[PDB]
Design a protein around this nucleic acid. Structure first.
Ligand SMILES: CCC[C@@H]1C[C@@H](C(=O)N[C@@H]([C@H]2O[C@H](SC)[C@H](O)[C@@H](O)[C@H]2O)[C@@H](C)O)N(C)C1
Ligand SMILES: [K+]
Ligand SMILES: [K+]
Ligand SMILES: [K+]
Ligand SMILES: [K+]
Ligand SMILES: [K+]
Ligand SMILES: [K+]
Ligand SMILES: [K+]
Ligand SMILES: [K+]
Ligand SMILES: [K+]
Ligand SMILES: [K+]
Ligand SMILES: [K+]
Ligand SMILES: [K+]
Ligand SMILES: [K+]
Ligand SMILES: [K+]
Ligand SMILES: [K+]
Ligand SMILES: [K+]
Ligand SMILES: [K+]
Ligand SMILES: [K+]
Ligand SMILES: [K+]
Ligand SMILES: [K+]
Ligand SMILES: [K+]
Ligand SMILES: [K+]
Ligand SMILES: [K+]
Ligand SMILES: [K+]
Ligand SMILES: [K+]
Ligand SMILES: [K+]
Ligand SMILES: [K+]
Ligand SMILES: [K+]
Ligand SMILES: [K+]
Ligand SMILES: [K+]
Ligand SMILES: [K+]
Ligand SMILES: [K+]
Ligand SMILES: [K+]
Ligand SMILES: [K+]
Ligand SMILES: [Mg+2]
Ligand SMILES: [Mg+2]
Ligand SMILES: [Mg+2]
Ligand SMILES: [Mg+2]
Ligand SMILES: [Mg+2]
Ligand SMILES: [Mg+2]
Ligand SMILES: [Mg+2]
Ligand SMILES: [Mg+2]
Ligand SMILES: [Mg+2]
Ligand SMILES: [Mg+2]
Ligand SMILES: [Mg+2]
Ligand SMILES: [Mg+2]
Ligand SMILES: [Mg+2]
Ligand SMILES: [Mg+2]
Ligand SMILES: [Mg+2]
Ligand SMILES: [Mg+2]
Ligand SMILES: [Mg+2]
Ligand SMILES: [Mg+2]
Ligand SMILES: [Mg+2]
Ligand SMILES: [Mg+2]
Ligand SMILES: [Mg+2]
Ligand SMILES: [Mg+2]
Ligand SMILES: [Mg+2]
Ligand SMILES: [Mg+2]
Ligand SMILES: [Mg+2]
Ligand SMILES: [Mg+2]
Ligand SMILES: [Mg+2]
Ligand SMILES: [Mg+2]
Ligand SMILES: [Mg+2]
Ligand SMILES: [Mg+2]
Ligand SMILES: [Mg+2]
Ligand SMILES: [Mg+2]
Ligand SMILES: [Mg+2]
Ligand SMILES: [Mg+2]
Ligand SMILES: [Mg+2]
Ligand SMILES: [Mg+2]
Ligand SMILES: [Mg+2]
Ligand SMILES: [Mg+2]
Ligand SMILES: [Mg+2]
Ligand SMILES: [Mg+2]
Ligand SMILES: [Mg+2]
Ligand SMILES: [Mg+2]
Ligand SMILES: [Mg+2]
Ligand SMILES: [Mg+2]
Ligand SMILES: [Mg+2]
Ligand SMILES: [Mg+2]
Ligand SMILES: [Mg+2]
Ligand SMILES: [Mg+2]
Ligand SMILES: [Mg+2]
Ligand SMILES: [Mg+2]
Ligand SMILES: [Mg+2]
Ligand SMILES: [Mg+2]
Ligand SMILES: [Mg+2]
Ligand SMILES: [Mg+2]
Ligand SMILES: [Mg+2]
Ligand SMILES: [Mg+2]
Ligand SMILES: [Mg+2]
Ligand SMILES: [Mg+2]
Ligand SMILES: [Mg+2]
Ligand SMILES: [Mg+2]
Ligand SMILES: [Mg+2]
Ligand SMILES: [Mg+2]
Ligand SMILES: [Mg+2]
Ligand SMILES: [Mg+2]
Ligand SMILES: [Mg+2]
Ligand SMILES: [Mg+2]
Ligand SMILES: [Mg+2]
Ligand SMILES: [Mg+2]
Ligand SMILES: [Mg+2]
Ligand SMILES: [Mg+2]
Ligand SMILES: [Mg+2]
Ligand SMILES: [Mg+2]
Ligand SMILES: [Mg+2]
Ligand SMILES: [Mg+2]
Ligand SMILES: [Mg+2]
Ligand SMILES: [Mg+2]
Ligand SMILES: [Mg+2]
Ligand SMILES: [Mg+2]
Ligand SMILES: [Mg+2]
Ligand SMILES: [Mg+2]
Ligand SMILES: [Mg+2]
Ligand SMILES: [Mg+2]
Ligand SMILES: [Mg+2]
Ligand SMILES: [Mg+2]
Ligand SMILES: [Mg+2]
Ligand SMILES: [Mg+2]
Ligand SMILES: [Mg+2]
Ligand SMILES: [Mg+2]
Lengths: 96, 50, 75
RNA sequence: CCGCGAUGGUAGUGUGGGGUCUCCCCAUGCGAGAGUAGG
RNA sequence: GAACUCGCUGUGAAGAUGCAGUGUACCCGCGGCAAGACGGAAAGACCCCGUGAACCUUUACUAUAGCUUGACACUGAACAUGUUCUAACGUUGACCCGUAAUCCGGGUUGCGGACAGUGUCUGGUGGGUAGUUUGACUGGGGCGGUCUCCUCCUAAAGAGUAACGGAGGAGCACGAAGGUUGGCUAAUCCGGAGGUUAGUGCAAUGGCAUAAGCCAGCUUGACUGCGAGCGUGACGGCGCGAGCAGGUGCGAAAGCAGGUCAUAGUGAUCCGGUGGUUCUGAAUGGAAGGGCCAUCGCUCAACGGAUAAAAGGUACUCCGGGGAUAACAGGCUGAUACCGCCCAAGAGUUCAUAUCGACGGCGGUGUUUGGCACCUCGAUGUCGGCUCAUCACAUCCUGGGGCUGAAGUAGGUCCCAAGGGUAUGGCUGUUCGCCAUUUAAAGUGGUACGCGAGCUGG
RNA sequence: GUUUAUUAAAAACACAGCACUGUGCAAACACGAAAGUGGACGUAUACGGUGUGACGCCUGCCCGGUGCCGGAAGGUUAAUUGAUGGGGUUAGCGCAAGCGAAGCUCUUGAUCGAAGCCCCGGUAAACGGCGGCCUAAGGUAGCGA
RNA sequence: AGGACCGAACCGACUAAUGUUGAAAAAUUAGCGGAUGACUUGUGGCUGGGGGUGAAAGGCCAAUCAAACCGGGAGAUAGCUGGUUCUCCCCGAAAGCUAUUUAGGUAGCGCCUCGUGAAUUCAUCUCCGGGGGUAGAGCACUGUUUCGGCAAAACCCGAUGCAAACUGCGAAUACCGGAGAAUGUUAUCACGGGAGACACACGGCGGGUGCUAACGUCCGUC
RNA sequence: UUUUGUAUAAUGGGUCAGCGACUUAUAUUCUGUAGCAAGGUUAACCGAAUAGGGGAGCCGAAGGGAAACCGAGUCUUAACU
RNA sequence: CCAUAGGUUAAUGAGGCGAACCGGGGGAACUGAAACAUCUAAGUACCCCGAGGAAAAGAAAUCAACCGAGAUUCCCCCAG
């Protein structure tokens, strides 16, 4: 980063933002992960057991990424509008 | 010699503009109708300290 | 007592006669109206002439004063 | 639309070459301004 | 480094045994001399450079021992809002014992006494001591000047373009000097002429009558969110911009308005302040703190801003480097200097030219003062003298000659001529110079201002 | 007399003499985190520090600056103390908005407060200074290329 | 009597010569100063490194002193100097700009190389569309200049020149864009891996500076 | 060797022999190559085991936003042509 | 005055050395920051005391997050 003594780029530009502690304990689940759990119920604990998310994850969101081709119950996870449609189209259900 | 001032919204939004003034020549308070983006209306703004 | 000068301002013609330009394109940077804005050409606050339409740059000498105008001939 | 102007010569000059090289000349290309006839 | 290791004149990283041309020269010792091998010796000590060192200085900066201030502690008792008291504490007073002891301890006693003194905290003082800072550019360095921004010229008719090049400006102003609609047109000279020769809030340039110049009325578009596209920058950035949404002013409306004729009027980031906020909130609810939006604090002017905070000395010096850069000498140059010539104002009784040559002109030398920084900083010893020289000729003497305002004697001036010759002393480090006294004369220059591996060392 | 052992022997250092100044003895002062020790088994005719440098004739004016000494009214001022105000939290009160005791807590900083400094004097054998209207005062005696 | 006098021993070290790869890392020779004193000398002791000691020279403290010596931190750091070892093949710079307590350092960009991707992408010429304010010229303007005329010597007029910061004119070239052919190993642009370089020199042309001095200096361009 | 430029009178080397200077560890990125592939790979450790076990982790398959959060979108803005 | 200090004798133990590791008492600077003072180097080098075959640490006034874990030590992750 030394530029010969000119105020370097990483000092002439301002700092911004803060780091969220909540982001570190939030994960995203792909539709392709929903079949990888044991027993057709997707919640934090079954996702942890399947090694899909880390053990310290407290919150998770299912997103429209990959495909779901089986009926799955999703319990206690947030689901995107697109993921909800994909899960319900595969005969699944979503429980808050 | 021109001093910086706030023009503060009369709509009570806390929105302000900033400008300069020569207080020696013009000691009276500057008052202008200006757009307040909080209420999204032209309202009276009145001079205050920076 | 000398030894001073200012930075050169890169004035002058940016798009010459017959050049195809997009709307917004600067045609000339200048001090005052050395050139004037013709058809489909705007004049900025620093006397910059810029295209208000897509087309070809055209220089022309018109008026009683015989002034250099810049227009855009729309494509 | 926006109240001058040939022809010829001269000045300058791109490229190549030369001299006695502060400045010129030759080959070739471009060729004013001013002025003149005239309009 | 290797050598089969001559002179000269040139050339050449610019002073050649080694290159060119040319001259000279059989092979090899010995004694001698030191002109050259930019001889040997020592990574120049001078000089500059390095965001090198050391030690020294101080009203440089920051600390700090020491000294000093007060608060609390060890530290107590009677009233005063005064002193007195003894019991803490001190005693480097006396005496006694441990004890064969001018230490130490214990005891007795006197004196002092909550003082003194010490600890923690705290203000002051503090080159006594310590760590450091003390800019860069620069025709060497220093001194002076400069450092950011704007305008013109240099700039070679696109842009850009350097110098310690040539000239000037800025570090603002303005709630109108901004917006819009309507209206108006100057300088200057003598109502007329004239036509911007004025005006522009302030430099200069390019603009401006449709006026951008100027006046009045009504105003706040000196709006908020955005932005096709483009210009200009290594980047950070900076600039121009139709159009879209919201809300506004002026005007009858078309339309115009996101500051000002344009181009200077400026300061990154960090740290923090203020207001706002569907953000965050370390068990949870809050809060603190943080984020986001708006905004504030730099002559940080060495103006891309090393720190919040900094001057000097070194001949007591030291290291790393540089002939990237100065002092000597060489080189290039020849302004200056010196020498020569051209013209002829005139002076010279008369007469420009015997002699002198105003105003001006043209050269030569390398020769003074300089310019440049090419050679040398892993060293090219630098002034003067002494010793020993050698060349040039622009000749001081002696030799030859022309002119003369040359009677003679003796001069003047110019030409030819380099064979030989060309003072000693006083003073001063002197070179030089002045002085004394000589001489036919006491020449002028080049030779690393000849000559310290020859001497001296003023 | 002394000195740069190894380029300087001197006009340098020292010196007797002089002056200023500190120092009352557990002296000042110095070495030492200290105990102690030197000063001194001395005691102001003594001891330390500083400058000057036998002797003779002498040693002028300036206290504005810097230091030192004395002063102590007034201004300013540390730790300390924590008055007052402002905020956070929440028992409650409110239908909600909000309000909000006590406690704890974050902040604010009244009052108290020594020396120093400012201030008022003194002091030149203290550091220093000693004119062309101006200064703190304008260089006396003596001497002088 | 005496820091008295002359002078050996003894203690010193003023001058000169020699010596300077010495006889000697300070001496020898001839002279020189002190020589009862603040003298000199033997033995032993004490003072220790920011410390000692110093009749004070930054002198001396084991041939070492503006901070001893030895060991350690330790391979301090060194934007500086030096040096950097076998072979062949292909390509092939820069000595510039901007910024910098920067100027002989370094960073981004420019220029080199390797890889990947992509357009008739690029170049030359011809033709077409462009803006110029240079060379030259000129004197209306802004200044400067001479002569004549005219006349409040102004102004005005005629005649003559001069200009980097004058322009009522104005090239060649160069540059931007468009079209077309031929030619060229994509010569072009983008992105990515690796750089080096940021002391340039002379010569030609156009110039500033200097004396149209310099193998001078500073730009532009080949 | 250093330089704009050195026969240079700039630097270095008296000669020979021997020694004498881009390494090593860990991280990271790019290229080549090999394996496996929407997956890839395990660390310590266990194991007599270069095996085998061990998937704790790490990288990748989703981004946008300061963040809450939304998510093939998201941020910006009252809202986007 | 009692006493205590003190004195003599006896018994028992200590003392000194040793390469590293270990706990504790003290504790630099060069250097890096392209200068330098905060900061760094580093609680390193070094000095000192003490120990043991190891030492130290150790049986929650510990974490966690409303679910739970269960002394200390060491290794790999978490994570530059
Ligand atoms: C104006 C001066 C110009 C400089 C003089 C010369 C130089 O440095 N000389 C050395 C000499 O010292 C000794 S002579 C005592 C040496 O023997 C001799 O060789 C030589 O190095 C000393 C005098 O400084 N430089 C090259 C240029
Ligand atoms: K354009
Ligand atoms: K020859
Ligand atoms: K010789
Ligand atoms: K007593
Ligand atoms: K007391
Ligand atoms: K220069
Ligand atoms: K020079
Ligand atoms: K609008
Ligand atoms: K600077
Ligand atoms: K210094
Ligand atoms: K010489
Ligand atoms: K002549
Ligand atoms: K005559
Ligand atoms: K030298
Ligand atoms: K001679
Ligand atoms: K004669
Ligand atoms: K002769
Ligand atoms: K000599
Ligand atoms: K010699
Ligand atoms: K000799
Ligand atoms: K003597
Ligand atoms: K005083
Ligand atoms: K409360
Ligand atoms: K020392
Ligand atoms: K660079
Ligand atoms: K590349
Ligand atoms: K050139
Ligand atoms: K060199
Ligand atoms: K040399
Ligand atoms: K690698
Ligand atoms: K790979
Ligand atoms: K979008
Ligand atoms: K340090
Ligand atoms: K550094
Ligand atoms: Mg896992
Ligand atoms: Mg310029
Ligand atoms: Mg300009
Ligand atoms: Mg013609
Ligand atoms: Mg013509
Ligand atoms: Mg020669
Ligand atoms: Mg011989
Ligand atoms: Mg001899
Ligand atoms: Mg030599
Ligand atoms: Mg050297
Ligand atoms: Mg006390
Ligand atoms: Mg001090
Ligand atoms: Mg100091
Ligand atoms: Mg240091
Ligand atoms: Mg220093
Ligand atoms: Mg400098
Ligand atoms: Mg141009
Ligand atoms: Mg051009
Ligand atoms: Mg250039
Ligand atoms: Mg340049
Ligand atoms: Mg310039
Ligand atoms: Mg865009
Ligand atoms: Mg801070
Ligand atoms: Mg909480
Ligand atoms: Mg908590
Ligand atoms: Mg906040
Ligand atoms: Mg700067
Ligand atoms: Mg800086
Ligand atoms: Mg040196
Ligand atoms: Mg040189
Ligand atoms: Mg010279
Ligand atoms: Mg004559
Ligand atoms: Mg004359
Ligand atoms: Mg010369
Ligand atoms: Mg040069
Ligand atoms: Mg030379
Ligand atoms: Mg040479
Ligand atoms: Mg040499
Ligand atoms: Mg002759
Ligand atoms: Mg002869
Ligand atoms: Mg002869
Ligand atoms: Mg003869
Ligand atoms: Mg004489
Ligand atoms: Mg000589
Ligand atoms: Mg001579
Ligand atoms: Mg000699
Ligand atoms: Mg002498
Ligand atoms: Mg004597
Ligand atoms: Mg000596
Ligand atoms: Mg002597
Ligand atoms: Mg005593
Ligand atoms: Mg004296
Ligand atoms: Mg007081
Ligand atoms: Mg007095
Ligand atoms: Mg007198
Ligand atoms: Mg005697
Ligand atoms: Mg002696
Ligand atoms: Mg003798
Ligand atoms: Mg005597
Ligand atoms: Mg005697
Ligand atoms: Mg001295
Ligand atoms: Mg010695
Ligand atoms: Mg030292
Ligand atoms: Mg170290
Ligand atoms: Mg080393
Ligand atoms: Mg090639
Ligand atoms: Mg700049
Ligand atoms: Mg011309
Ligand atoms: Mg011109
Ligand atoms: Mg073309
Ligand atoms: Mg450079
Ligand atoms: Mg350069
Ligand atoms: Mg240069
Ligand atoms: Mg150049
Ligand atoms: Mg030239
Ligand atoms: Mg040159
Ligand atoms: Mg030249
Ligand atoms: Mg050189
Ligand atoms: Mg050669
Ligand atoms: Mg030779
Ligand atoms: Mg050589
Ligand atoms: Mg060298
Ligand atoms: Mg050698
Ligand atoms: Mg994401
Ligand atoms: Mg540093
Ligand atoms: Mg044991
Ligand atoms: Mg244990
Ligand atoms: Mg529980």
């Amino acid at each position: 980063g030394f530029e010969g003594g000119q105020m370097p780029l990483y000092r002439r530009l301002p700092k911004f933002g803060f780091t969220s502690r909540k982001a570190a304990i939030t994960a995203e689940i792909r539709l392709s992960d929903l079949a990888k759990v044991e027993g057709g119920v997707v919640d934090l604990n079954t996702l942890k057991a399947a090694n899909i998310i880390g053990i310290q994850i407290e919150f998770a969101k299912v997103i429209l990424a990959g495909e779901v081709t089986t009926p799955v119950t999703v319990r206690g996870l947030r689901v995107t509008k697109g993921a909800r449609a994909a899960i319900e189209a595969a005969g699944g259900k979503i429980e808050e | 010699i021109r001093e910086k001032i706030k023009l503060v919204s009369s709509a009570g939004t806390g929105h302000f503009y900033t400008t300069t003034k020569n207080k020696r020549t013009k000691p009276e308070k500057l008052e202008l109708k200006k757009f307040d983006p909080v209420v999204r209306q032209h309202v009276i703004y009145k001079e205050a300290k920076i | 007592r000398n030894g001073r000068d200012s930075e050169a301002k890169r004035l002058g013609v940016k798009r010459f006669g017959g050049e195809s330009v997009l709307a917004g394109s600067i045609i000339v940077r200048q001090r005052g109206t050395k050139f004037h804005a013709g058809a489909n050409v705007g004049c900025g606050r620093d006397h910059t002439l810029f295209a208000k339409a897509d087309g070809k740059v055209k220089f022309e000498v018109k008026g009683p004063k015989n002034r250099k105008f810049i227009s855009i001939e729309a494509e």
